[PDB]
Amino acid sequence: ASMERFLSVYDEVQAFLLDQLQSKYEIDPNRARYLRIMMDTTCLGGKYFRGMTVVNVAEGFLAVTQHDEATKERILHDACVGGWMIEFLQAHYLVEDDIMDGSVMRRGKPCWYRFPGVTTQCAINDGIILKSWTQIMAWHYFADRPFLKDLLCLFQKVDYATAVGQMYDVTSMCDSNKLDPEVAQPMTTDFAEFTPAIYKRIVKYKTTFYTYLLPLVMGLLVSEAAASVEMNLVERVAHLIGEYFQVQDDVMDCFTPPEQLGKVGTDIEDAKCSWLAVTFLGKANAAQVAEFKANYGEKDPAKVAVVKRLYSKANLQADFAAYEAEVVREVESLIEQLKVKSPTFAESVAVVWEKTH
Amino acid sequence: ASMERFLSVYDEVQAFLLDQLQSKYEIDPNRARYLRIMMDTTCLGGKYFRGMTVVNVAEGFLAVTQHDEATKERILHDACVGGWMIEFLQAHYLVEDDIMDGSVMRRGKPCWYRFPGVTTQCAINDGIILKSWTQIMAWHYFADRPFLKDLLCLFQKVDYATAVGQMYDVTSMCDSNKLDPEVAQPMTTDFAEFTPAIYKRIVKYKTTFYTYLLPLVMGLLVSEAAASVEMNLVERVAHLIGEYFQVQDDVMDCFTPPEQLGKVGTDIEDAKCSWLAVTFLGKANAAQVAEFKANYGEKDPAKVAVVKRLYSKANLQADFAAYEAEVVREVESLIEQLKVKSPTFAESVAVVWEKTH
């Protein structure tokens, strides 16, 4: 099965990377063990949604395309390697983002930089190595492949879009007109930049390119199937599903209990431009807006409890139901448009949506 | 002239990157200004030795190769773009290394992360963007170039070697057998790993690939001149000159006054595996070794002053003179071997050596 092939390829890639460090980079066994532990701790334990989307898209095409058995095996192995490039790209951004944000946990486990024998000094570089490994595995496994050029170019643009999104996110509680490397940034007092368009831009770049666009397009590239789709349509459906995914994460940060969330949610304390804050500001009256400004972006638990009460009272659940209903209409419309050129790819998008929704 | 062409291309590359952020990445003017300031602050103000080595190697080949004038202009523009990819790669590693090390200054200016309106939260991501920009400029400027594949593959391997070297450096004061993500790392008490071979490995990977090998090989690639050299010989001369460069930096960290150094040197406090510590341990008697162990890797100024006194008393200046004499013999031997296939490239190596020495 797909998951078992995917996990087996992780062991193969790891062995290759570590053997190459020994044969070419003069690594010693203790540092190779540190790196093996770092790779397992940062890359494993999740759902592998991104990596498995590449494999699922590739298997959809295998069902409808004539190939020798050895070719089907090669395509699946390429989809697994490609899927691991995305999982390692994610691992790079989670390691770095956890250090940037001073995060404590991620999925009921301490953040990598918090491990006693790691520290921020190592962890920042470990994050750098994680991304460097994505390129090492591409050049090694896809050296003779016709899709190598397109895959490297796509991967670079998605990585860049992600870093641009991280910039939009970390600066989301500042006033744009006040941004200045020379002056410490005050948190906004007016919240004028907490709008649906500004929120959409953070989410589009920070998450949707690496979580949805990259796995779908990589599945097409390893299958040599990019002519079966209109790329503008794949972009629109990736950004749409990706946004819905983040709206879910945002609601969960505030209302999902820490035991289920796998961390203590701090979007309110961090003054993040969340779906809840933007949607609340789109419907609140004068007194509610004023109460929001006097309590948002503060570590004080009483102030955090005021914000959480305003959200519950504002009936944000109704806004979510309306938003979700709108997303369902649009996702179905885009799936219908994809069916024109590829029913197989349209079906893979339907699975990705079902897994998100 | 070469420097003026190089600096003009910086303005062109910057304009391209910022215009693309506006046209494709939905950036607003204030964030574009933040990124312009970040790029200028982290990429400019140095000697441009790495970037200018690419241009110098390319101009050596232009003097001896028949080309149309438009081709000479294209090669020089490519050498400038390539040179900026290396300067931006350096900027990425200096931004991240300064955060990793908790550095205060670099070249008489505060480290980027210390700027009031920057902070570590932004700076880590700014460092990520700096490296992402190297790939954006390669795919844009070299899209149709025959050397694009080789240049991207070389750049990736050098970037990876550099991150591996940073790992060797940050772990250089730990006992290898004790490395463990689960356990806080004690500083070595025996200093058994402060050997010439271990020192050589840190330096080879941390600095020599991006400072010497990459500029020389990029100059060959943009000139389509890689067949004029034995790559094993270019590697050996890059690693040799690169090591000598680091031995100089190490001596300067301890003995060059802070006003001239552009920072307060902390290798002793940081327990770094420096050329001075390794060379001292290679000649010290029992009492001197014991005094070294009781004072090294400590913030205490009196303890730092004991270490500095042991180095002066050990006549490390004589060891440096002997080392420098050995490097001169070997660099001349390698330059002689390079003259066989390319007197022009051998001359560029001679200039790189003269600039280092």
Ligand SMILES: O=C(O)Cc1csc2ccc(Cl)cc12
């Ligand atoms: O256009 C997109 O959405 C994705 C993309 C970026 S570079 C590249 C190269 C080849 C193919 Cl098929 C797609 C892409």
Ligand SMILES: O=C(O)Cc1csc2ccc(Cl)cc12
């Ligand atoms: O997806 C889009 O709307 C088009 C686009 C804008 S920046 C960027 C970076 C990478 C890729 Cl693959 C696509 C895009």
Ligand SMILES: O=C(O)Cc1csc2ccc(Cl)cc12
């Ligand atoms: O072999 C080296 O030292 C440098 C290197 C790494 S990948 C690559 C591709 C083409 C050329 Cl000409 C050199 C290199």
Ligand SMILES: O=C(O)Cc1csc2ccc(Cl)cc12
């Ligand atoms: O320079 C060498 O001795 C050969 C080598 C080992 S790891 C590595 C990474 C990148 C390049 Cl360009 C060369 C090498």
Ligand SMILES: [Zn+2]
């Ligand atoms: Zn974050």
Ligand SMILES: [Zn+2]
């Ligand atoms: Zn969240």
Ligand SMILES: [Zn+2]
């Ligand atoms: Zn450092």
Ligand SMILES: [Zn+2]
């Ligand atoms: Zn130094």
